[PDB]
Design a protein around this ligand. Structure first.
Ligand code: CL
Ligand code: MG
Ligand code: MG
Ligand code: NA
Length: 264
């Protein structure tokens, strides 16, 4: 089997299809903003879930994470050394100094959007601020590589180069999370090709106008290795270092990359 799927080109959406995906993605965007406002010291991650879920439903969409291979919530809420897939719960209470990653997806009229970001509760630790900003820059670096005629791993390589520049910018070593990455997305949340956050340029399928990928760098302040907790979902750094996660669903167009999961 091919690591990157069967198709020579990442499936091209039409302009109407991209608008339909962008309407799903604005809802995810709206959900992320509402969750971030609600996310104060003393609030539980389950309260955040309820906030995200309402926003999704009141806009006429459905949360794509809910019941997804058994996942119990509408968001992942991963805190500090938790990387991805944190399960919202009444006993995960946010405290001042926490680093919070929120991951969210929605479906509207059969089309998916998937986005994530990381922010601080209260006043951010300086190492954490650099971590989250480096992750965001790595995402932006990947997004800028979404041009017609590039190949999949040009995006991977641009993400990685963005990570190393952010290292030089912050005088800090960042661990690129091993074994997790982005993906194609459209009528389902997860489609081929898997998108690495690092690797040699010029491999995997071509990008063309209309091709969409979910671009999602994950960085740590230490190791590149992770394990899964006994809850079977929550992913944590093996060394206890904190981690960040940023993501957008992004289309290649004639006029340059288009974020389909825009925030209000
Ligand atoms: Cl996949
Ligand atoms: Mg996501
Ligand atoms: Mg994703
Ligand atoms: Na984290």
């Amino acid at each position: 089997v091919g690591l990157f799927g069967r198709k020579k080109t990442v499936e091209q959406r039409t302009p109407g299809e991209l608008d339909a995906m962008a309407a799903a993605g604005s809802i995810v965007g709206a959900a992320l903003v509402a969750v971030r406002d609600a996310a104060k010291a003393g609030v539980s991650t389950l309260e955040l879930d309820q906030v995200a879920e309402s926003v999704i439903r009141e806009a006429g969409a459905v949360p794509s994470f809910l019941g997804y291979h058994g996942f119990p919530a509408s968001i992942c809420s991963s805190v500090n050394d938790q990387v991805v897939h944190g399960i919202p719960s009444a006993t995960a209470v946010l405290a001042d100094g926490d680093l919070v990653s929120i991951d969210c997806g929605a479906i509207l009229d059969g089309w998916h959007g998937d986005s994530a970001w990381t922010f601080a509760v209260g006043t951010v630790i300086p190492s954490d601020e650099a971590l989250s900003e480096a992750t965001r820059l790595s995402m932006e670096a990947g997004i800028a590589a979404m041009i017609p005629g590039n190949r999949l791993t040009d995006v991977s390589h641009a993400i990685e180069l963005g990570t190393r520049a952010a290292e030089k910018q912050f005088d800090r070593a960042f661990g690129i999370v091993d074994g997790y990455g982005g993906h194609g997305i459209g009528r389902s949340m997860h489609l081929d090709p898997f998108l690495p956050n690092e690797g040699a340029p010029g491999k995997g399928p071509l990008l063309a106008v209309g091709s969409v990928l979910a671009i999602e760098p994950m960085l740590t302040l230490g190791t590149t290795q992770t394990r899964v907790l006994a809850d079977d979902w929550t992913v944590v750094t093996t060394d206890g270092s904190r981690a960040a996660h940023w993501e957008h669903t992004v289309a290649v167009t004639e006029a340059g990359p288009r974020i389909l999961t825009m925030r209000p």
